[PDB]
Amino acid sequence: TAGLVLAXLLV
């Protein structure tokens, strides 16, 4: 995660 954004599977 980037704040409340998923940068793919899974950050």
Side-chain angles (χ1 to χ4, degrees):
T1 60
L4 305 174
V5 151
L6 301 40
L9 192 72
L10 206 204
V11 208

Short mmCIF file of all heavy atoms in Angstrom, two decimals:
data_model
loop_
_atom_site.label_atom_id
_atom_site.label_comp_id
_atom_site.label_asym_id
_atom_site.label_seq_id
_atom_site.Cartn_x
_atom_site.Cartn_y
_atom_site.Cartn_z
N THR A 1 0.75 -1.31 0.00
CA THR A 1 0.00 0.00 0.00
C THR A 1 0.77 1.34 0.00
O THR A 1 1.74 1.54 0.73
CB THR A 1 -1.24 0.16 0.92
OG1 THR A 1 -1.01 -0.01 2.32
CG2 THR A 1 -2.44 -0.67 0.40
N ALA A 2 0.32 2.29 -0.83
CA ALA A 2 0.76 3.67 -0.86
C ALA A 2 -0.35 4.50 -0.17
O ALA A 2 -1.34 4.85 -0.82
CB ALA A 2 1.02 4.03 -2.34
N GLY A 3 -0.29 4.89 1.17
CA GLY A 3 -1.52 5.39 1.84
C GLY A 3 -2.79 4.51 1.71
O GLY A 3 -2.76 3.39 2.20
N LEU A 4 -3.94 4.93 1.05
CA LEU A 4 -4.99 3.95 0.61
C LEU A 4 -5.01 3.52 -0.89
O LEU A 4 -6.09 3.35 -1.47
CB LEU A 4 -6.40 4.31 1.18
CG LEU A 4 -6.45 4.46 2.72
CD1 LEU A 4 -7.84 4.96 3.13
CD2 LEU A 4 -6.16 3.15 3.47
N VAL A 5 -3.84 3.33 -1.53
CA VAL A 5 -3.72 2.84 -2.91
C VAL A 5 -3.01 1.48 -2.90
O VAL A 5 -1.95 1.38 -2.29
CB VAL A 5 -2.95 3.89 -3.74
CG1 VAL A 5 -2.16 3.32 -4.91
CG2 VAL A 5 -3.89 4.99 -4.23
N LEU A 6 -3.52 0.37 -3.55
CA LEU A 6 -2.69 -0.88 -3.72
C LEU A 6 -1.71 -0.87 -4.92
O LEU A 6 -2.15 -0.84 -6.08
CB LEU A 6 -3.48 -2.22 -3.85
CG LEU A 6 -4.47 -2.78 -2.81
CD1 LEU A 6 -5.39 -1.76 -2.13
CD2 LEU A 6 -5.34 -3.88 -3.44
N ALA A 7 -0.40 -0.91 -4.70
CA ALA A 7 0.62 -0.86 -5.77
C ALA A 7 0.77 -2.21 -6.52
O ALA A 7 1.81 -2.51 -7.10
CB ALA A 7 1.93 -0.32 -5.20
N UNK A 8 -0.28 -3.04 -6.52
CA UNK A 8 -0.34 -4.38 -7.12
C UNK A 8 -0.66 -5.52 -6.12
O UNK A 8 -1.53 -5.36 -5.26
CB UNK A 8 -1.36 -4.34 -8.26
N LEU A 9 0.02 -6.73 -6.15
CA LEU A 9 -0.20 -7.87 -5.20
C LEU A 9 0.99 -8.37 -4.33
O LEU A 9 1.69 -9.32 -4.72
CB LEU A 9 -0.91 -9.01 -5.97
CG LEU A 9 -1.47 -10.15 -5.11
CD1 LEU A 9 -2.71 -9.73 -4.32
CD2 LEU A 9 -1.82 -11.36 -5.99
N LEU A 10 1.30 -7.79 -3.10
CA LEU A 10 0.46 -6.74 -2.44
C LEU A 10 1.10 -5.58 -1.59
O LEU A 10 1.33 -5.75 -0.39
CB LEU A 10 -0.66 -7.49 -1.64
CG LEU A 10 -2.04 -6.83 -1.33
CD1 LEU A 10 -2.65 -7.52 -0.10
CD2 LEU A 10 -1.97 -5.32 -1.06
N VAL A 11 1.42 -4.35 -2.15
CA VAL A 11 1.98 -3.19 -1.36
C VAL A 11 1.16 -1.88 -1.21
O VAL A 11 0.84 -1.28 -2.23
CB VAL A 11 3.40 -2.78 -1.83
CG1 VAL A 11 4.19 -2.15 -0.66
CG2 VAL A 11 4.25 -3.92 -2.41
#
